[PDB]
Amino acid sequence: IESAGFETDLRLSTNGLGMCQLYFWHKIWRKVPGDVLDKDAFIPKLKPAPINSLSRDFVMKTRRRKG
Amino acid sequence: SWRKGTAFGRGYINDMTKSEYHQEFLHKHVR
Amino acid sequence: NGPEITPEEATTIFSVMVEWLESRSFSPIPFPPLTYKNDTKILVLALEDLKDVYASKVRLNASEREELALIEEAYDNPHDTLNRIKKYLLTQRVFKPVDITMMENYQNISPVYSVDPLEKITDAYLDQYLWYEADQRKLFPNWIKPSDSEIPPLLVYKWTQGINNLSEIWDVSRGQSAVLLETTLGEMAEKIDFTLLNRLLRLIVDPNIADYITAKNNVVINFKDMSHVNKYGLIRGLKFASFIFQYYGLVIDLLLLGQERATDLAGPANNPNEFMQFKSKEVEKAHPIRLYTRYLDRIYMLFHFEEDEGEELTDEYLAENPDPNFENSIGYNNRKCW
Amino acid sequence: PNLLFSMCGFEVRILPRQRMEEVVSNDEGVWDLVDERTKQRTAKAYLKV
Amino acid sequence: GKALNNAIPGGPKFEPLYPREEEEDYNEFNSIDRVIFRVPIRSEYKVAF
Amino acid sequence: QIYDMTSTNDVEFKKKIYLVLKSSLSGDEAAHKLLKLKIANNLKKSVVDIIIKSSLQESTFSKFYSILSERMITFHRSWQTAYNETFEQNYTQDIEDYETDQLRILGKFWGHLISYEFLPMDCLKIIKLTEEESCPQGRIFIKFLFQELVNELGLDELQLRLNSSKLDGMFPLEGDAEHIRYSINFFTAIGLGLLTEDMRSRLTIIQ
Amino acid sequence: TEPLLDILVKGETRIQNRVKLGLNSKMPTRFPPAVFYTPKELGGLGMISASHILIPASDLSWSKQTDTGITHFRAGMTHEDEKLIPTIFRYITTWENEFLDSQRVWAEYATKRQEAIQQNRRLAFEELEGSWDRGIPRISTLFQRDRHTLAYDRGHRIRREFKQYSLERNSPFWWTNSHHDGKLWNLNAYRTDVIQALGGIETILEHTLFKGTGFNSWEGLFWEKASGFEDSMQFKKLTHA
Amino acid sequence: ALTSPERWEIRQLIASGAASIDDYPE
Amino acid sequence: VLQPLLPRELPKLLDALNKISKYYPGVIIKVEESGEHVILGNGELYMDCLLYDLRASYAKIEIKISDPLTVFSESCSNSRLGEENLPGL
Amino acid sequence: SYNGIGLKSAKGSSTSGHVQRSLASNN
């Protein structure tokens, strides 16, 4: 989710020296730092949320895609 | 209850100045 | 096609104003008396009002000079002129034409009438006199307000503070709702119909003066070649055209409210309220209507509802305009700023 | 939550402070509505032209 | 850079080329309720891919 | 090396500030321009004072100066300190030089920093209530300050903020029953006097 | 309001552009803002400029939704070397205030009237003086000259409108009668701030010929009034051309 | 009764909203 | 995510979507109850190579594309009962 | 990095088109 612009940010910031590749083999996963349900969670509205609740966010969003 | 109180108890015309558009228009601008 | 009102509507309206006024216990205005104690003052006012147009000017055209003359003499010979007037109202029913010129706003246009100086002087005197006697006797209630005491932004202010500081609107505990209307009266003058006027003025003013007015509207109106009698609408350029207009809108209002609710807002003649007041909170709560405020054309209304009443309305409306489409949110309109 | 309207030139919005839920200091385009009796600011009004 | 009306920071600026962007329906698809703001999307992305 | 009589360069500076203050719609724009200058930690005191003196030319309080202050603090703390200092300055030393008007601008003006926590609250405590030493000026100053801060918090949230404040020079519970008459009485005079209760109980307790 | 600020910047630029083409030029170096902003006395147009500013520009896309709050500024108008210029909005007290001040002031006056009644005295004019300019009806009115007359004026607002209909020219402030309302704003201070903010009299005149008239002494100069020719020539039958 | 000046001052006070009904002349 | 710019064009899009699934093997495609379509792919460049080949070759219609999102998943870390909607089971 | 802040172009808009970050509002 964080990798969006990434490869440019690199390729620019170093003035042409440098390169990057991203990929998924080991199929690793990781817990997302939030508490998967909170009615008291903070949601920023147009800012990257606070990491104390990331997951609550993602749930209440994706669910707002489906319903 | 309340709603009863009040006193009132229950195309294309070939022309211009008689048109519906034109009368809208003149009803805006010249005002 | 004949006049639009139909006699039916006419009679209902007239009776309305009547029960209002009797209920309001109102004394009509008298003809300006020959022996008047304040009189010269009032004439000072009106004449300064005309004078002011010409204060700034450096070149005076023909009609102008004609005017300034007529004024200056009117200062000089106050008893003369006052006699001249009281004559004119008692009698003259036919008048010179009037002249339209449109002025540009680069978007809209507006008509600018022009009367003829004698006719002006009378008017302005009578205008002044009316407002004085009326406000003296409290004809127009609280809620009619392009009024004296409040410059417009201040009106906005007191209107919010009214909205708020009335009891309870912010409790959404249940389904409770509240709704504002913003409206125009569309054509309002341009449908004013004289024979109905001349009656409605027989109510509030001596049959003379009234006659002077109603007869004061029918004129020729000359733009360049085009000219036509004014048989029907109301000419706003008339110095007193204000007054009438407010008056006539009151009639509209006594409908939109209906008798009682108005009698809430005014309270007794003895204790007319200020702009937003009542006696008990119930007086607010005896009805869904809480605030009603009308500024020239635009009408502003504030309804306080609970799911019961509100859903009974949406029961009526829906019942008669069913939309399984659920598309009633298409043409519906709110602000593009916010 | 809002209530809207417009008079003379002004475009007003009204927020009662209850359902603001996140309150802040605002610069001067904002009137504060005050309960007649209790003397609090129970709603902010915003203005525009 | 031109054709999208964007500007590489050190770049030459030009005219819109598809000037009317202002037409828009009020339409739920890309709305805020339903989107995640995590990384901002600077221009150079938009010129890079 | 010179024994220096006058700072004229620093009156130049004084201008440029006041000027930047008098351009600018809004308030959150002035904040910017100032912060754009990159003033040195020396002067980040005096700059503040300039602002406040302009505020006192100004015929009435204005949200502008307040939102300017706030958006300046949340940028960095050095401004924070600079303010708290200036509060010490004004209240203690410099009240003596102000007319009963300009306290109307202040009282509120600190009201908005203190209601919303940019001050923070307890830095008040420095202020004391005594016939011993208080200026009738200072009396009025504080008076206003509450009749503003109240009108936001509404005397209840303020019940909290006080109850966790531990303001003493203002509120002894432990002595000066006389000065408890002066305190509590004086908050009957301001009129609020509904956060004065426990002290009233104490009055009843000493005897 | 964004778009209004937008219009300000445009409009004002357009006017200055008028005076400019009035000669022949848009060149910016010829017209430093001294030229347009020095008060009439020093020989400038004295135009009161609130274009300048910096104009909050934030990311329209979302500002069609959230109200994202200001993140950036866009330079409204410019300079070459900058200085800055004070803008009107800063010299005019906002409504909320003046309503509040009014409220208090008229309270004070309620009391002092009750005393001066109780003591059967007539007012000090001082007891009232500090508040002379405050208040929405602007205490001053109480003591205006012709009051005994103006009691009998009524409905001045309406008239101040319907004048729309009854005559050609505007009188752009309809919404007030300086008789009934007092007078709702003052400026002057502006003059002073614009004067100095341009760099003070001594720089401003470096732009003029004022060292070519040989006067070494400044403030003693009043200009003069080209009053005479117009009275003499205007009235006389000059060709329309 | 109030007199020409006196009606005027009271009127301005009422205009502010100051006057309660109590104090009007009549 | 995806949506066609004009609703009336939905079919043409589908006729291309099936194509893409063939020509690019790794991709994985979905619909919802929404009518939105979802395009799951290896990497950013890969999505670029698609969306170009979506617009300028197979379907011709312009479309609206979401901000880059990701997948998620559901795990857990530690009386207990359940029921039918018509209590027979 | 023109990020959507700013103008379509300063050709008609009488400004210079200059856009600067706002120091004030960050948190």
Side-chain angles (χ1 to χ4, degrees), chain F residues 39-104:
Chain F
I39 299 166
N41 298 275
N42 296 280
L43 312 169
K44 295 157 71 181
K45 164 64 175 69
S46 172
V47 164
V48 159
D49 188 3
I50 292 174
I51 283 168
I52 293 167
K53 285 181 185 183
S54 289
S55 180
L56 296 174
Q57 300 295 332
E58 196 61 18
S59 185
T60 311
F61 179 88
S62 61
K63 291 267 208 53
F64 166 67
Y65 288 106
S66 299
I67 210 179
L68 167 56
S69 294
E70 305 166 6
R71 303 281 183 279
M72 184 160 289
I73 289 169
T74 67
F75 172 72
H76 192 71
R77 72 160 64 91
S78 68
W79 298 98
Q80 175 77 251
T81 63
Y83 287 131
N84 286 345
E85 172 180 359
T86 62
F87 188 76
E88 295 173 17
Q89 281 299 317
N90 292 285
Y91 169 73
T92 63
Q93 301 164 4
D94 194 48
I95 294 298
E96 300 305 321
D97 299 348
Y98 295 141
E99 180 54 20
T100 65
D101 173 19
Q102 298 160 337
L103 302 189
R104 192 176 312 285

Coordinates of all heavy atoms in Angstrom, one line a residue, chain F residues 39-104:
Chain F
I39 N 12.9 34.8 11.6 CA 13.4 35.7 12.6 C 14.3 34.9 13.6 O 14.1 33.7 13.8 CB 12.2 36.4 13.3 CG1 11.4 37.2 12.3 CG2 12.7 37.3 14.4 CD1 10.1 37.6 12.9
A40 N 15.3 35.6 14.1 CA 16.3 34.9 15.0 C 15.7 34.8 16.4 O 14.8 35.5 16.8 CB 17.6 35.7 15.1
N41 N 16.2 33.8 17.2 CA 15.6 33.5 18.5 C 15.7 34.6 19.5 O 14.9 34.6 20.5 CB 16.2 32.2 19.1 CG 15.9 31.0 18.2 OD1 14.9 30.4 18.3 ND2 16.9 30.7 17.3
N42 N 16.6 35.5 19.3 CA 16.7 36.7 20.1 C 15.3 37.5 20.0 O 14.6 37.6 21.0 CB 17.8 37.7 19.5 CG 19.2 37.1 19.7 OD1 19.8 37.1 20.8 ND2 19.7 36.5 18.6
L43 N 15.0 37.9 18.8 CA 13.9 38.8 18.5 C 12.5 38.2 18.6 O 11.5 38.9 18.6 CB 14.1 39.4 17.2 CG 15.6 39.9 17.0 CD1 15.8 40.3 15.6 CD2 15.8 41.0 18.0
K44 N 12.5 36.8 18.6 CA 11.1 36.2 18.6 C 10.3 36.5 19.8 O 9.2 36.1 19.9 CB 11.3 34.7 18.3 CG 11.9 34.4 16.9 CD 12.6 33.1 16.8 CE 11.5 32.0 16.8 NZ 12.2 30.7 16.6
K45 N 10.9 37.2 20.7 CA 10.2 37.8 21.8 C 9.6 39.1 21.3 O 8.4 39.2 21.3 CB 11.1 38.1 23.0 CG 10.5 39.1 24.0 CD 9.3 38.6 24.6 CE 8.8 39.5 25.7 NZ 8.3 40.7 25.0
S46 N 10.4 40.1 20.9 CA 10.0 41.5 20.6 C 9.0 41.5 19.5 O 8.0 42.2 19.6 CB 11.2 42.3 20.3 OG 10.7 43.6 19.8
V47 N 9.2 40.7 18.5 CA 8.2 40.6 17.4 C 6.8 40.4 18.0 O 5.9 41.1 17.7 CB 8.5 39.4 16.5 CG1 7.3 39.0 15.6 CG2 9.7 39.8 15.6
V48 N 6.7 39.4 18.9 CA 5.4 39.2 19.6 C 4.9 40.5 20.2 O 3.8 40.9 19.9 CB 5.5 38.2 20.7 CG1 4.4 38.3 21.7 CG2 5.7 36.8 20.1
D49 N 5.7 41.2 21.0 CA 5.2 42.4 21.6 C 4.6 43.4 20.6 O 3.5 43.9 20.7 CB 6.3 43.1 22.4 CG 5.7 44.2 23.2 OD1 4.5 44.4 23.2 OD2 6.5 45.0 23.9
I50 N 5.4 43.5 19.4 CA 4.9 44.4 18.4 C 3.4 44.1 18.1 O 2.5 45.0 18.1 CB 5.7 44.4 17.1 CG1 7.1 44.9 17.4 CG2 5.0 45.2 16.0 CD1 8.0 44.7 16.2
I51 N 3.2 42.9 17.8 CA 1.8 42.4 17.4 C 0.9 42.9 18.4 O -0.1 43.6 18.1 CB 1.8 40.8 17.4 CG1 2.5 40.3 16.2 CG2 0.4 40.3 17.5 CD1 2.8 38.9 16.1
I52 N 1.1 42.6 19.7 CA 0.1 42.9 20.7 C -0.1 44.4 20.8 O -1.3 44.8 20.9 CB 0.5 42.4 22.1 CG1 0.4 40.8 21.9 CG2 -0.5 42.8 23.1 CD1 1.1 40.1 23.1
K53 N 0.9 45.2 20.6 CA 0.7 46.7 20.6 C -0.2 47.1 19.5 O -1.1 47.9 19.7 CB 2.0 47.5 20.7 CG 2.5 47.3 22.1 CD 3.8 48.1 22.4 CE 4.2 47.8 23.8 NZ 5.4 48.5 24.3
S54 N 0.0 46.5 18.3 CA -0.9 46.8 17.2 C -2.4 46.4 17.6 O -3.3 47.2 17.4 CB -0.6 46.0 15.9 OG 0.6 46.6 15.4
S55 N -2.5 45.3 18.2 CA -3.8 44.8 18.7 C -4.4 45.9 19.6 O -5.7 46.0 19.5 CB -3.7 43.5 19.5 OG -5.0 43.1 19.9
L56 N -3.7 46.7 20.3 CA -4.2 47.7 21.2 C -4.5 49.0 20.5 O -5.2 49.8 21.1 CB -3.3 47.8 22.4 CG -3.4 46.5 23.1 CD1 -2.5 46.3 24.3 CD2 -4.8 46.2 23.6
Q57 N -3.9 49.3 19.4 CA -4.4 50.4 18.6 C -5.8 50.2 18.1 O -6.5 51.2 17.8 CB -3.4 50.6 17.4 CG -2.0 50.9 17.7 CD -1.8 52.2 18.5 OE1 -2.6 53.2 18.3 NE2 -0.7 52.3 19.3
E58 N -6.3 49.0 18.1 CA -7.2 48.5 17.0 C -8.7 48.7 17.4 O -9.5 48.1 16.7 CB -6.9 47.0 16.8 CG -7.5 46.4 15.5 CD -7.0 47.0 14.2 OE1 -6.0 47.7 14.2 OE2 -7.7 46.8 13.2
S59 N -9.1 49.4 18.4 CA -10.5 49.8 18.5 C -11.4 48.7 19.1 O -12.4 49.0 19.6 CB -11.1 50.3 17.2 OG -12.4 50.8 17.3
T60 N -11.0 47.4 18.9 CA -11.7 46.3 19.5 C -10.9 45.0 19.2 O -10.0 45.0 18.3 CB -13.1 46.1 18.8 OG1 -13.8 47.3 18.8 CG2 -13.9 45.0 19.6
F61 N -11.2 44.0 20.0 CA -10.6 42.7 19.7 C -10.9 42.3 18.3 O -11.9 42.7 17.7 CB -11.3 41.6 20.6 CG -10.8 40.3 20.4 CD1 -9.7 39.8 21.1 CD2 -11.5 39.5 19.5 CE1 -9.3 38.5 20.9 CE2 -11.1 38.2 19.3 CZ -10.0 37.7 20.0
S62 N -10.0 41.5 17.7 CA -10.3 40.9 16.4 C -9.8 39.5 16.3 O -8.6 39.2 16.7 CB -9.8 41.7 15.3 OG -8.4 41.8 15.4
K63 N -10.6 38.6 15.8 CA -10.2 37.2 15.6 C -8.8 37.1 14.9 O -8.1 36.2 15.1 CB -11.3 36.5 14.8 CG -12.6 36.3 15.6 CD -12.6 34.9 16.2 CE -14.0 34.3 16.4 NZ -14.8 34.3 15.1
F64 N -8.6 38.0 14.0 CA -7.3 38.0 13.2 C -6.1 37.7 14.1 O -5.5 36.7 13.9 CB -7.2 39.3 12.6 CG -5.9 39.6 12.0 CD1 -5.4 38.9 11.0 CD2 -5.1 40.7 12.5 CE1 -4.2 39.2 10.4 CE2 -3.9 41.0 11.9 CZ -3.4 40.2 10.9
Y65 N -5.8 38.6 15.1 CA -4.6 38.5 15.9 C -4.6 37.2 16.6 O -3.5 36.6 16.7 CB -4.5 39.7 16.9 CG -4.2 41.0 16.2 CD1 -5.1 42.0 16.0 CD2 -2.9 41.2 15.7 CE1 -4.8 43.2 15.3 CE2 -2.6 42.3 15.0 CZ -3.5 43.3 14.8 OH -3.1 44.4 14.1
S66 N -5.7 36.6 17.0 CA -5.8 35.4 17.7 C -5.4 34.3 16.8 O -4.6 33.4 17.1 CB -7.1 35.1 18.3 OG -7.5 36.2 19.2
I67 N -6.0 34.2 15.6 CA -5.7 33.1 14.8 C -4.3 33.2 14.3 O -3.6 32.2 14.0 CB -6.6 32.9 13.6 CG1 -6.7 31.4 13.2 CG2 -6.1 33.7 12.4 CD1 -7.6 31.2 12.1
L68 N -3.7 34.4 14.2 CA -2.3 34.6 13.9 C -1.4 33.9 14.9 O -0.5 33.2 14.6 CB -2.1 36.1 13.8 CG -0.6 36.4 13.7 CD1 -0.1 35.7 12.5 CD2 -0.4 37.9 13.6
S69 N -1.7 34.3 16.2 CA -0.9 33.7 17.3 C -1.0 32.2 17.2 O 0.1 31.6 17.1 CB -1.4 34.2 18.6 OG -1.2 35.6 18.7
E70 N -2.1 31.6 17.1 CA -2.3 30.2 17.2 C -1.5 29.5 16.1 O -0.6 28.7 16.3 CB -3.7 29.8 17.2 CG -4.5 30.6 18.3 CD -6.1 30.5 18.1 OE1 -6.4 29.7 17.1 OE2 -6.9 31.1 18.8
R71 N -1.8 29.8 14.8 CA -1.0 29.3 13.7 C 0.4 29.6 13.7 O 1.2 29.1 13.0 CB -1.6 29.8 12.3 CG -3.0 29.5 12.0 CD -3.3 28.1 11.6 NE -4.7 28.0 11.3 CZ -5.7 27.8 12.1 NH1 -5.4 27.7 13.5 NH2 -6.9 27.7 11.7
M72 N 0.9 30.5 14.6 CA 2.3 30.7 14.8 C 2.9 29.8 15.8 O 4.0 29.2 15.5 CB 2.6 32.1 15.2 CG 4.0 32.4 15.3 SD 4.2 34.2 15.2 CE 3.8 34.3 13.5
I73 N 2.2 29.6 16.9 CA 2.6 28.7 17.9 C 2.8 27.2 17.4 O 3.9 26.6 17.3 CB 1.7 28.7 19.1 CG1 1.9 30.0 19.9 CG2 1.9 27.5 20.0 CD1 0.8 30.2 20.9
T74 N 1.7 26.7 16.8 CA 1.7 25.3 16.3 C 2.8 25.1 15.3 O 3.0 23.9 14.8 CB 0.4 24.9 15.7 OG1 0.1 25.6 14.5 CG2 -0.7 25.1 16.7
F75 N 3.5 26.1 14.8 CA 4.6 25.9 13.9 C 5.9 25.5 14.7 O 6.7 24.7 14.2 CB 4.9 27.1 13.1 CG 6.2 27.1 12.3 CD1 6.3 26.3 11.2 CD2 7.3 27.9 12.7 CE1 7.5 26.2 10.5 CE2 8.5 27.8 12.0 CZ 8.5 27.0 10.9
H76 N 6.1 26.1 15.9 CA 7.3 25.8 16.6 C 7.1 26.3 18.1 O 6.3 27.1 18.4 CB 8.5 26.6 16.0 CG 9.8 26.2 16.5 ND1 10.3 24.9 16.2 CD2 10.7 26.8 17.3 CE1 11.5 24.8 16.8 NE2 11.7 25.9 17.5
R77 N 7.9 25.7 19.0 CA 7.7 26.1 20.4 C 8.4 27.4 20.8 O 7.9 28.0 21.7 CB 8.2 24.9 21.3 CG 9.7 24.7 21.4 CD 10.1 23.9 22.6 NE 9.6 22.5 22.7 CZ 10.3 21.5 22.2 NH1 11.5 21.6 21.7 NH2 9.7 20.3 22.3
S78 N 9.5 27.7 20.2 CA 10.2 28.9 20.5 C 9.2 30.1 20.6 O 9.3 31.0 21.4 CB 11.3 29.3 19.5 OG 10.7 29.6 18.3
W79 N 8.2 30.1 19.7 CA 7.1 31.0 19.8 C 6.3 30.8 21.0 O 5.8 31.8 21.6 CB 6.3 30.9 18.5 CG 7.1 31.3 17.3 CD1 7.6 30.4 16.5 CD2 7.4 32.6 16.8 NE1 8.3 31.1 15.5 CE2 8.1 32.4 15.7 CE3 7.0 33.9 17.2 CZ2 8.6 33.5 14.9 CZ3 7.5 34.9 16.5 CH2 8.3 34.8 15.4
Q80 N 6.1 29.5 21.4 CA 5.3 29.2 22.6 C 5.9 29.9 23.8 O 5.2 30.7 24.5 CB 5.4 27.7 22.8 CG 4.7 27.2 24.1 CD 3.2 27.2 24.0 OE1 2.6 28.1 24.6 NE2 2.7 26.3 23.2
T81 N 7.2 29.7 24.0 CA 7.9 30.4 25.1 C 7.8 31.9 25.0 O 7.4 32.5 26.0 CB 9.4 30.0 25.1 OG1 10.0 30.5 23.9 CG2 9.6 28.5 25.1
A82 N 8.0 32.4 23.8 CA 8.0 33.8 23.6 C 6.6 34.4 24.1 O 6.6 35.4 24.9 CB 8.1 34.1 22.1
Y83 N 5.6 33.7 23.8 CA 4.3 34.1 24.3 C 4.2 34.1 25.8 O 4.2 35.1 26.5 CB 3.0 33.4 23.7 CG 2.8 33.9 22.3 CD1 2.6 33.0 21.2 CD2 2.7 35.2 22.0 CE1 2.4 33.4 19.9 CE2 2.5 35.7 20.7 CZ 2.4 34.8 19.6 OH 2.2 35.2 18.4
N84 N 4.4 32.9 26.4 CA 4.2 32.8 27.9 C 5.0 33.9 28.6 O 4.5 34.6 29.5 CB 4.7 31.4 28.4 CG 3.7 30.4 28.1 OD1 2.5 30.7 27.8 ND2 4.0 29.1 28.2
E85 N 6.2 34.1 28.1 CA 7.0 35.3 28.6 C 6.1 36.5 28.5 O 5.7 37.1 29.5 CB 8.3 35.5 27.8 CG 9.0 36.7 28.1 CD 10.3 36.9 27.3 OE1 10.6 35.9 26.5 OE2 11.0 37.9 27.4
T86 N 5.7 36.9 27.3 CA 4.9 38.1 27.1 C 3.7 38.2 28.0 O 3.4 39.3 28.5 CB 4.5 38.4 25.7 OG1 3.6 37.3 25.3 CG2 5.7 38.4 24.7
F87 N 3.1 37.1 28.3 CA 2.0 37.1 29.3 C 2.6 37.5 30.7 O 1.9 38.4 31.4 CB 1.4 35.7 29.4 CG 0.2 35.7 30.3 CD1 -1.0 36.1 29.8 CD2 0.2 35.2 31.6 CE1 -2.2 36.1 30.6 CE2 -0.9 35.1 32.4 CZ -2.1 35.6 31.9
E88 N 3.7 37.1 31.0 CA 4.3 37.5 32.3 C 4.5 39.0 32.3 O 4.1 39.8 33.2 CB 5.6 36.8 32.6 CG 5.5 35.3 32.8 CD 6.8 34.5 32.9 OE1 7.9 35.2 33.1 OE2 6.8 33.3 32.8
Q89 N 5.1 39.5 31.1 CA 5.4 40.9 30.9 C 4.2 41.7 31.2 O 4.1 42.5 32.1 CB 5.8 41.1 29.4 CG 7.2 40.8 29.1 CD 8.1 41.6 29.9 OE1 7.9 42.8 30.1 NE2 9.2 40.9 30.4
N90 N 3.2 41.5 30.4 CA 2.0 42.3 30.4 C 1.3 42.3 31.7 O 1.2 43.4 32.3 CB 0.9 41.8 29.3 CG 1.4 42.0 28.0 OD1 1.4 43.1 27.5 ND2 1.9 40.9 27.3
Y91 N 1.0 41.1 32.2 CA 0.2 41.0 33.4 C 1.0 41.7 34.6 O 0.4 42.5 35.3 CB -0.1 39.6 33.8 CG -0.7 39.6 35.2 CD1 -1.9 40.2 35.4 CD2 0.1 39.3 36.2 CE1 -2.4 40.3 36.7 CE2 -0.3 39.4 37.5 CZ -1.6 39.9 37.7 OH -2.1 40.0 39.0
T92 N 2.2 41.2 34.8 CA 2.9 41.7 36.0 C 3.3 43.1 35.8 O 2.8 44.0 36.5 CB 4.2 40.8 36.2 OG1 5.1 41.0 35.1 CG2 3.8 39.3 36.3
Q93 N 4.3 43.4 34.9 CA 4.9 44.7 34.8 C 3.9 45.7 34.1 O 3.6 46.7 34.7 CB 6.1 44.6 34.0 CG 7.2 43.7 34.7 CD 8.3 43.3 33.7 OE1 8.4 43.7 32.6 NE2 9.2 42.4 34.2
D94 N 3.5 45.3 32.9 CA 3.0 46.3 31.9 C 1.5 46.7 32.0 O 1.1 47.6 31.3 CB 3.4 45.8 30.5 CG 3.3 46.9 29.5 OD1 3.8 48.0 29.7 OD2 2.7 46.6 28.4
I95 N 0.8 46.0 32.8 CA -0.6 46.4 33.0 C -0.7 47.9 33.4 O -1.6 48.6 33.0 CB -1.4 45.5 34.0 CG1 -1.5 44.1 33.5 CG2 -2.7 46.1 34.3 CD1 -2.4 44.0 32.3
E96 N 0.3 48.3 34.2 CA 0.2 49.6 34.8 C 0.1 50.7 33.8 O -0.4 51.8 34.1 CB 1.4 49.9 35.7 CG 1.5 48.9 36.9 CD 0.3 48.8 37.8 OE1 -0.3 49.9 38.0 OE2 -0.1 47.7 38.2
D97 N 0.5 50.4 32.6 CA 0.5 51.4 31.5 C -0.7 51.4 30.6 O -0.7 52.1 29.6 CB 1.8 51.3 30.7 CG 3.0 51.4 31.5 OD1 2.9 51.9 32.7 OD2 4.1 51.1 31.0
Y98 N -1.7 50.6 30.9 CA -2.9 50.5 30.0 C -4.2 51.1 30.7 O -4.4 50.9 31.9 CB -3.1 49.0 29.6 CG -2.0 48.5 28.8 CD1 -1.6 47.2 29.0 CD2 -1.4 49.3 27.8 CE1 -0.6 46.7 28.2 CE2 -0.4 48.8 27.0 CZ 0.0 47.5 27.2 OH 1.0 47.0 26.4
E99 N -4.9 51.7 29.8 CA -6.2 52.2 30.1 C -7.3 51.1 30.1 O -7.2 50.1 29.5 CB -6.6 53.3 29.0 CG -8.0 53.9 29.2 CD -8.1 54.5 30.5 OE1 -7.1 54.8 31.2 OE2 -9.3 54.8 30.9
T100 N -8.4 51.4 30.8 CA -9.4 50.5 31.1 C -10.1 49.9 29.8 O -10.9 49.0 29.9 CB -10.6 51.1 31.9 OG1 -11.2 52.1 31.2 CG2 -10.0 51.6 33.2
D101 N -9.8 50.5 28.7 CA -10.3 50.0 27.4 C -9.4 48.8 27.1 O -9.8 47.7 27.3 CB -10.2 51.0 26.3 CG -10.4 50.4 25.0 OD1 -11.0 49.3 24.9 OD2 -10.0 51.0 23.9
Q102 N -8.1 49.0 26.8 CA -7.3 48.0 26.2 C -7.3 46.6 27.0 O -7.1 45.6 26.4 CB -5.9 48.5 26.1 CG -5.9 49.7 25.2 CD -4.6 50.6 25.4 OE1 -4.0 50.5 26.5 NE2 -4.3 51.3 24.4
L103 N -7.6 46.7 28.2 CA -7.9 45.4 28.9 C -9.1 44.7 28.3 O -9.2 43.5 28.4 CB -8.3 45.8 30.4 CG -7.1 46.5 31.1 CD1 -7.5 46.6 32.6 CD2 -5.8 45.8 30.9
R104 N -10.0 45.4 27.6 CA -11.1 44.7 26.9 C -10.6 43.9 25.7 O -11.2 42.9 25.4 CB -12.1 45.7 26.5 CG -13.4 45.2 26.0 CD -14.3 46.4 25.6 NE -14.3 47.4 26.8 CZ -14.9 47.1 27.9 NH1 -15.7 46.1 28.1 NH2 -14.7 48.0 28.9

